[PDB]
Ligand binder design. Structure first.
Ligand SMILES: [Cl-]
Length: 132
């Protein structure tokens, strides 16, 4: 019941130890230029960026994807971040301490802050996107 693109975003953001690979990130960035794929990718990222707690890997990996898209995918990816800027900004405050006491949330907060900073700096983002 998944499109090819939906399988790819699901895998890229799964609750597992794998980090999204460069090949997958590039595939997603290239596919983001096709409108139908763009919406499928962003709808799944929306779901996963809004996860929490024990499922923080969904959030962290979706931020990894979203940053890659902002840098290398279609301009629509940037527009999406601006429309949904509130969600990204709240991730700066994401918390989760695991059973063994480790702060797993800090990685999400740092990533969110970096992305907020990039989105807030139009000239830097335009330059980054141009060289990419
Ligand atoms: Cl398909």
């Amino acid at each position: 019941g998944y499109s090819s693109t939906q399988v790819l975003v699901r895998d890229a953001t799964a609750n597992d130890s794998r980090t999204p690979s460069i090949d997958t990130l590039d595939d997603l960035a290239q596919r983001s230029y096709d409108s139908v794929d763009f919406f499928e990718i962003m709808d799944m990222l929306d779901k996963r960026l809004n996860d929490k707690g024990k499922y923080w890997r969904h959030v962290a990996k979706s931020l990894t994807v979203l940053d890659y898209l902002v840098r290398f995918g279609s301009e629509n990816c940037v527009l999406w971040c601006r429309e949904n800027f509130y969600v990204i900004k709240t991730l700066r405050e994401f918390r989760h301490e695991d059973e063994e006491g480790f702060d797993q949330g800090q990685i999400i907060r740092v990533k969110a802050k970096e992305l907020v900073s990039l989105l807030n700096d139009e000239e830097r983002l335009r330059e980054e996107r141009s060289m990419n």
